[PDB]
mmCIF file of all heavy atoms in Angstrom:
data_model
loop_
_atom_site.group_PDB
_atom_site.id
_atom_site.type_symbol
_atom_site.label_atom_id
_atom_site.label_comp_id
_atom_site.label_asym_id
_atom_site.label_seq_id
_atom_site.Cartn_x
_atom_site.Cartn_y
_atom_site.Cartn_z
ATOM 1 N N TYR B 15 7.350 1.710 -9.363
ATOM 2 C CA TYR B 15 8.023 1.733 -8.215
ATOM 3 C C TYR B 15 9.435 1.431 -8.357
ATOM 4 O O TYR B 15 9.654 0.344 -9.075
ATOM 5 C CB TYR B 15 7.374 0.774 -7.126
ATOM 6 C CG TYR B 15 5.877 0.768 -7.037
ATOM 7 C CD1 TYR B 15 5.078 0.060 -7.890
ATOM 8 C CD2 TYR B 15 5.202 1.552 -6.149
ATOM 9 C CE1 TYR B 15 3.787 0.012 -7.898
ATOM 10 C CE2 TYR B 15 3.842 1.604 -6.106
ATOM 11 C CZ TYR B 15 3.217 0.771 -7.009
ATOM 12 O OH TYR B 15 1.721 0.792 -6.985
ATOM 13 N N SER B 16 10.382 2.075 -7.872
ATOM 14 C CA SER B 16 11.870 1.778 -8.000
ATOM 15 C C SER B 16 12.405 1.653 -6.585
ATOM 16 O O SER B 16 11.810 1.668 -5.569
ATOM 17 C CB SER B 16 12.528 2.862 -8.843
ATOM 18 O OG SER B 16 13.854 2.371 -9.092
ATOM 19 N N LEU B 17 13.829 1.502 -6.656
ATOM 20 C CA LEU B 17 14.541 1.316 -5.391
ATOM 21 C C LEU B 17 15.949 1.861 -5.592
ATOM 22 O O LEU B 17 16.555 1.676 -6.724
ATOM 23 C CB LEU B 17 14.556 -0.097 -5.085
ATOM 24 C CG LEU B 17 14.728 -0.520 -3.556
ATOM 25 C CD1 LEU B 17 13.504 0.003 -2.731
ATOM 26 C CD2 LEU B 17 14.954 -1.979 -3.362
ATOM 27 N N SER B 18 16.552 2.435 -4.598
ATOM 28 C CA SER B 18 17.867 3.043 -4.778
ATOM 29 C C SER B 18 18.870 1.858 -5.057
ATOM 30 O O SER B 18 18.733 0.812 -4.564
ATOM 31 C CB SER B 18 18.231 3.718 -3.519
ATOM 32 O OG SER B 18 17.224 4.485 -2.922
ATOM 33 N N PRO B 19 19.876 2.219 -5.894
ATOM 34 C CA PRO B 19 20.869 1.135 -6.219
ATOM 35 C C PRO B 19 21.685 0.751 -4.988
ATOM 36 O O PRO B 19 22.378 -0.166 -4.987
ATOM 37 C CB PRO B 19 21.699 1.809 -7.277
ATOM 38 C CG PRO B 19 21.553 3.297 -7.083
ATOM 39 C CD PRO B 19 20.149 3.469 -6.666
ATOM 40 N N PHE B 20 21.674 1.690 -3.926
ATOM 41 C CA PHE B 20 22.484 1.454 -2.753
ATOM 42 C C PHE B 20 21.847 0.559 -1.762
ATOM 43 O O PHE B 20 22.308 0.251 -0.669
ATOM 44 C CB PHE B 20 22.881 2.805 -2.102
ATOM 45 C CG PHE B 20 23.925 3.513 -2.879
ATOM 46 C CD1 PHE B 20 23.408 4.587 -3.641
ATOM 47 C CD2 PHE B 20 25.180 3.155 -2.853
ATOM 48 C CE1 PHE B 20 24.353 5.311 -4.333
ATOM 49 C CE2 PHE B 20 26.078 3.864 -3.635
ATOM 50 C CZ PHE B 20 25.710 5.003 -4.317
ATOM 51 N N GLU B 21 20.507 0.123 -2.035
ATOM 52 C CA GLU B 21 19.749 -0.680 -1.121
ATOM 53 C C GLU B 21 19.379 -1.983 -1.708
ATOM 54 O O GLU B 21 18.693 -2.851 -1.092
ATOM 55 C CB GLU B 21 18.471 -0.003 -0.654
ATOM 56 C CG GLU B 21 18.714 1.465 -0.419
ATOM 57 C CD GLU B 21 17.781 2.056 0.596
ATOM 58 O OE1 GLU B 21 16.596 1.680 0.629
ATOM 59 O OE2 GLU B 21 18.226 2.877 1.461
ATOM 60 N N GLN B 22 19.768 -2.323 -2.948
ATOM 61 C CA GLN B 22 19.555 -3.533 -3.594
ATOM 62 C C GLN B 22 20.771 -4.193 -4.200
ATOM 63 O O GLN B 22 21.680 -3.463 -4.655
ATOM 64 C CB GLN B 22 18.419 -3.337 -4.715
ATOM 65 C CG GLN B 22 18.843 -2.291 -5.793
ATOM 66 C CD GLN B 22 17.798 -2.253 -6.819
ATOM 67 O OE1 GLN B 22 17.728 -3.150 -7.705
ATOM 68 N NE2 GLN B 22 17.144 -1.191 -6.917
ATOM 69 N N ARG B 23 20.836 -5.499 -4.247
ATOM 70 C CA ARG B 23 21.946 -6.233 -4.717
ATOM 71 C C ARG B 23 22.187 -5.925 -6.272
ATOM 72 O O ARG B 23 21.191 -5.855 -7.056
ATOM 73 C CB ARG B 23 21.875 -7.608 -4.482
ATOM 74 C CG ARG B 23 21.108 -8.016 -3.253
ATOM 75 C CD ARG B 23 21.735 -8.896 -2.423
ATOM 76 N NE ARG B 23 21.689 -10.287 -2.932
ATOM 77 C CZ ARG B 23 20.677 -11.081 -2.954
ATOM 78 N NH1 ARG B 23 19.526 -10.679 -2.379
ATOM 79 N NH2 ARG B 23 20.795 -12.285 -3.429
ATOM 80 N N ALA B 24 23.407 -5.837 -6.574
ATOM 81 C CA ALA B 24 23.678 -5.723 -8.138
ATOM 82 C C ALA B 24 23.783 -6.953 -8.832
ATOM 83 O O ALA B 24 23.643 -6.940 -10.080
ATOM 84 C CB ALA B 24 25.057 -4.834 -8.242
ATOM 85 N N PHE B 25 23.856 -8.120 -8.214
ATOM 86 C CA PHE B 25 23.824 -9.333 -8.808
ATOM 87 C C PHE B 25 22.753 -10.272 -8.040
ATOM 88 O O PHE B 25 23.130 -11.234 -7.405
ATOM 89 C CB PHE B 25 25.246 -10.035 -8.839
ATOM 90 C CG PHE B 25 26.216 -9.363 -9.666
ATOM 91 C CD1 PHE B 25 27.265 -8.700 -9.097
ATOM 92 C CD2 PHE B 25 26.019 -9.239 -11.039
ATOM 93 C CE1 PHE B 25 28.201 -8.052 -9.832
ATOM 94 C CE2 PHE B 25 27.020 -8.612 -11.828
ATOM 95 C CZ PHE B 25 28.070 -8.004 -11.208
#
Side-chain angles (χ1 to χ4, degrees):
Chain B
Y15 319 82
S16 190
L17 208 65
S18 317
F20 293 101
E21 322 207 320
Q22 56 176 288
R23 331 230 285 286
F25 294 113

